[PDB]
Scaffold this active site. Sequence first.
Site, short mmCIF file in Angstrom:
data_model
loop_
_atom_site.label_atom_id
_atom_site.label_comp_id
_atom_site.label_asym_id
_atom_site.label_seq_id
_atom_site.Cartn_x
_atom_site.Cartn_y
_atom_site.Cartn_z
CG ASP G 51 47.88 23.74 51.28
OD1 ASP G 51 47.85 23.57 52.51
OD2 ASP G 51 48.05 24.85 50.74
CB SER G 76 45.70 18.39 45.11
OG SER G 76 44.46 18.13 44.48
NE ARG G 77 44.60 18.93 53.83
CZ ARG G 77 44.06 18.13 54.74
NH1 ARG G 77 44.39 16.85 54.82
NH2 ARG G 77 43.17 18.62 55.59
CB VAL G 78 43.28 22.95 46.72
CG1 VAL G 78 42.38 23.96 46.04
CG2 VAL G 78 44.28 23.64 47.62
N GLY G 79 41.66 20.34 45.87
CA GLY G 79 40.65 19.60 45.15
C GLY G 79 40.09 20.37 43.97
#
Lengths: 49, 100, 117, 114, 114, 232, 221, 29, 100, 57
Positions: G51, G76-79
Site C-alpha cells: 500500500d 503511502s496510498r493510505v495517506g
Amino acid sequence: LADADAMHAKALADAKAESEKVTEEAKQDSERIAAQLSEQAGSEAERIK
Amino acid sequence: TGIKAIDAMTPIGRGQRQLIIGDRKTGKTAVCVDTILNQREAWLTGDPKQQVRCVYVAIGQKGTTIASVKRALEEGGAMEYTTIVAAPASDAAGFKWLAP
Amino acid sequence: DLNVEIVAVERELWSGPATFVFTRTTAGEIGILPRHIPLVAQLVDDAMVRVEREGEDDLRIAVDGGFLSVTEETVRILVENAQFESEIDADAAKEDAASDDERTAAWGRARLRALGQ
Amino acid sequence: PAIVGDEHYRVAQEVIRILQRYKDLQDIIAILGIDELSEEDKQLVNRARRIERFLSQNMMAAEQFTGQPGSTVPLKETIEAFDKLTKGEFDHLPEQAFFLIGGLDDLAKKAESL
Amino acid sequence: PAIVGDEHYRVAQEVIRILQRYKDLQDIIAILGIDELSEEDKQLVNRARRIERFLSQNMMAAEQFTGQPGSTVPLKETIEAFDKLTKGEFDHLPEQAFFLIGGLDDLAKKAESL
Amino acid sequence: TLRELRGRIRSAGSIKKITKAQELIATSRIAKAQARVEAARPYAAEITNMLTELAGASALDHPLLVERKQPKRAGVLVVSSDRGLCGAYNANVLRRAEELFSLLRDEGKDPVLYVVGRKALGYFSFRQRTVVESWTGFSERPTYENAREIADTLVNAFMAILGVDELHIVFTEFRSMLSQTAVARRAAPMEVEYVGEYSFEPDPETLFDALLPRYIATRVYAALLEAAASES
Amino acid sequence: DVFYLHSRLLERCAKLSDELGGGSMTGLPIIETKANDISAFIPTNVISITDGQCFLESDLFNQGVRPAINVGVSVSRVGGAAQIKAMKEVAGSLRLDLSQYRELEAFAAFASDLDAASKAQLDRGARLVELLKQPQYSPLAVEEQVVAIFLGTQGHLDSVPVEDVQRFESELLEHVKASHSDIFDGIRETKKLSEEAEEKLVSVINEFKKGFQASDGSSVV
Amino acid sequence: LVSVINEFKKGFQASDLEKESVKVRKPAP
Amino acid sequence: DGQCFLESDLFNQGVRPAINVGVSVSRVGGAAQIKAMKEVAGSLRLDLSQYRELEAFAAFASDLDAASKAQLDRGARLVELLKQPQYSPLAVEEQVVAIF
Amino acid sequence: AEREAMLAKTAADNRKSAEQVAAAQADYEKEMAEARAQASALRDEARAAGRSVVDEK
Ligand SMILES: Nc1ncnc2c1ncn2[C@@H]1O[C@H](COP(=O)(O)OP(=O)(O)OP(=O)(O)O)[C@@H](O)[C@H]1O
Ligand SMILES: [Mg+2]
C-alpha cells in the site's frame, strides 16, 4: 543629546537586565538538562544490571 | 515510525503494508529498527489499544547481524515486546522460505 | 519655473523641479533662472552643481566632466558620474583629492566642493 | 559515532558528501565546463579531486607497481588530514601533491618537490 | 473532426494550445514571477487559468460531501462555453467564479454571486 | 551496456536541469540588459542633440570628422562575450569581423585588432592575428568606465606611435528577442549628414572638440550594452 | 507463484473489523534493489502488492540525507488517514514545499536573479530537508515530530542558518520537553495542535531563538 | 646521456557596413 | 597476470599500439623490467593514467593551473613518445633512453 | 564666535545624538550576544557533563 545619553544609559541598564534574564534562563536550563541526563544515566544503569 | 520523513510524508497506518525498498547499506534495517523502538512509549502505556507488538523476521542475515539487531532493540528496551524469527543464511532454503 | 534633469550616461539621477541652478562652467561660474536663453557649456573638471528648489534644502552635486544645456524648458546636466552630497564618503574625498592622476584628483576635488569642503 | 568517534565520523561523512557531489558534477564538468559551475561547486570540485588523490596511498606490497617504498598513515593523522582537506586548508596545493602520497609530512615533501 | 464535430475539434485544439502555453510559461511564473511576462503572455496566462479551472466540475459523486447536486452539461453547451472562454469573453470574471461550476448559466450565477 | 545507458540518462537529466536554469537566468538578464539600454538611451539622445547644435555652430574640421588623405590602417573593435554557452553569438560577431577585414583588405587598409571579450581574444590568438589591446570581464555587465577606456584608446589611436586612419566597431545589435545581428559600424571618421532646418561658452569649437570624444564614448557604451543584451 | 508467495504473505496484514476484536497487523517488508532498479521482478511484485513505498536511495544517503527516503517517489496510498490531526495539519504544506525545492535546486547557484517568492521557497526547502534528517536509533514521539515540522513549515526556521537547523530543532525540542512540557502533553492527549497551544509554542520558539548561538556566531531572532 | 641530449637539442631543428554620423541642422554645405 | 587493453578509439587517434594506459596493468611490474627501465619508467603508467583523467577533465576549462598545464604537456609528450610504428622493435637500452 | 561655536556644537550634537542612539543599540546587541553566547556555551558544557555522567553510570 541629553535624551540620547539617557537612552544609552537605559539601554545599558536593559543590557544588564537581559544578562540577568540570560543567567536566570541558562542556570535553570543547565539544571534541568543535568536532571534529565542524570535520569537517563540512572535509567540506563538500571536497564543494564 | 519515529522517522520524521515517514510520519510526515509517507505515513503508515495500523494495517498498512509499507514496503521499505532500497539498495544495500541505505538505511532499511535502520528505519525498521527505529520503528520498532518507537513503540516502547506505547508499550509502557499498558493499553492494548495503543501497544504495538513487533515481530522482526530476519531472512538470510548473518548471525552476528541478527545479534546486532537484538542488541539494538535490547539497549533501547524494545525487546520486551519484540520477537525475532531468525532464519540466518546458514539455515536451509526451507527456513528462509518459511520465516515470513 | 525650471526643472533640473541631472542625467548620467548610465542612468538618470535627478529630475525634480528647481528655481535656480549654479555651476562652474569652463567660462566661469554661471547661474540659471527660468527662461534663460538656450546655452551649451562644458563644466570644469572639478565642477560642482548647486540646485535651489521650492522648500527643500539646497542640493549639491559632484559632477565628473559634465555638460550643461539650458533649454527653453529644461536645464539638462549630462554627467559621466554624478554623486549627491548624501552619497559622499568625506574621508575618501579627502584622500582622493591628493591623487597623482589628474582625473581622479579632479573628481576628488569635485566631491569635496560638494561636501561643503 | 558511538564506535569510531565523533570526529572520525564527521570527517568521513564530509568526505563522502564531497565525493558524491563531485560525482554528480562530473557529467556537467565533462560536457558544459567547470566554469559554468557555481563558486561553491567549483571549490568543492577542487577539494574533491584532492581528496580522491589523497585517498590513494603507496602501499608497502605494491612497490613493484610504483617503485617507491610503502607508508603507514596513523588513523588520527588520517582523520586530521582529511579534516584539513574538507575545510580547504590544502586547496592551494596542486592536485599531484596528493597523489600516491602517504600522509601530511610526505604531502609537504611532494608539494615542495613540485 | 471525422467523428467529433469540426467546431468541437477546433475548440478542443485551441484549449489544448492555450493550456500548453500556460504550462510552458509556468516555469517563468514560478521562477521570475508573473511580472516578467509580456502583456500578451499575461493575458494568455490569465485566460488559461480560467480555462483549466473551468474544466473542473461539481461532480455527481460530490453530492455526498458538498450537498449540491451534480451537473451534467450537454456537449454542445461545453463546446460553446469553451469557445467563449478561449476567445476571452469571460476573462474579466474572477478565477474563483469557475471552480467546480457546472456549465455556463451556472457560471453566470457564480459570477453574479461574486 | 545498460549501466552505461543509465549513466548517460543521469548525465542528460543533470544537463537538462542546468541548461533550463541557465535559460531562465538568461531571460532575467535579457530583461536587465534591455532595461540598462533603455536607461542609457536618454543621455545618448541629449548628447546627440547638443552635438548637432554645436555642429550647426562649428566648422566641422575636427580630425574625427575628416577623412585621412590616404587611409593605410584601420582599427576594428570586436565586441564579444567573455563566457560561452551563447551559441553562434561570438561566431556571428567574429565572422562579420572577418568580412569587414576582407573589405578592408580589398581597400588596401590593414586592420588593427582591438578586442572586447575573452572568446574573440582566443579566436584571434588561434589565427595568430595580433591584438594591440584587449579588455575583458565586462561583456556580461558593462559600465561606462570600460566604455570610456575603450573609446579613449580608440580615439588616441585614431589621432596618432603608428595609430590608425579609421576605426570600426563590430558588435551584435539587439533589435528584438528573436533577432541578434552582428554589424560593423565606422565610428571614425564620422560623416556629416545635413538634415536641414543657441549660445555657447566660451566657443562652440572647443565644446565640439571636448564633446566628440564624449559622443564616441557614449556610442561605444551603447554598443557594449547592446552586445550584452544580445549575448543574453 | 512467487507473486502469490509474497501476496499471500502480505495480505495477512490487515486491520480487522470490530467484530473480530479490532486488532491489526502492519507489515514493513524490506527489499534490496540492485543498482536501484525498482523495475526488477521481486521489487515490482512487492511494489504492486504493498500500500506504500519508501524508496531509500544511496545517492541521498551519501549526500547526508538520512534515513535517505527519496521524497516525491515514495508514497503511502493510505495517506492522511494514517496521521494524527496535528501531524496532518502541520505537514500538509511539507510535500509541496519539498517538490518546489527539488524543482528550484538548480537555481541555488544564481539565486541573485530569483523572484522573492522563489528564493523564499528555495530557502524553506533547504531547511525542511535538514529538518527531515535524523540520527540512527533516535526515533521521535509523534508530538516532537509535530513540533519539528511546525518549526519547518510555519517558517520559524527561515532565520536559522541551514547548517544549524538540526541542532536548533534538537535544542528546542529538548527545551520544550524540559521547561514547557505542556505543549507535548496537549498534542499527545488531544491529537491536535490548538490555537491556545500554537500561540504558546510560537512564544517558546521566539524565547529560545534568542538563546541560540548559530555555528557561525550569528544571532537568530 | 643528459649531456648528449642537451648538445643534440642545440642542433635539433624543430619543425615549428554603416556609418556613424553627426547630424548638422542646415540644408547644404 | 595482467592485461594490455587495446582500444579502437586510441588506435584511430594515432596512439599505436593503442594500449589504454588506465585499464592496462602488469602485476609482475618492475620485477619483469631491467633495473634501468624500472628506474626511468617506475611511475609512467600511473602518470599517464592521471594525465588521461586530467585531459578528460580539462577538456573545456578556460584556464588551468600551472601544475595542471605542466602535467598536460608532460603527458602529451609521453604519449607521443609511446607511439611506435609496426615492425619497429626497439632494444631495451633504446627504450630506457627514450623513456628517460 | 559664540554664534560660531553654537552652530558647531549644535550640528555635532544632532549627529552625535543619532550616533549615540546607534551606539546604545550596538552596545545592547553586543552585550546580548555575549550573554547568549555564555548561555549557549554553558548549556553545551552542561550537556557534555551529562554525557560524561551517563558514561560513568
Ligand atoms: N538515519 C541514519 N543516520 C545515520 N546513519 C545511518 C542511518 N540509518 C542507517 N545508518 C547507517 O547506515 C549503514 C547501513 O544501515 P542499515 O544497517 O540500516 O543498512 P540496510 O540499508 O538495512 O542494509 P543491509 O541490511 O543490506 O546491510 C549503517 O552504518 C547504519 O549505521
Ligand atoms: Mg538490512
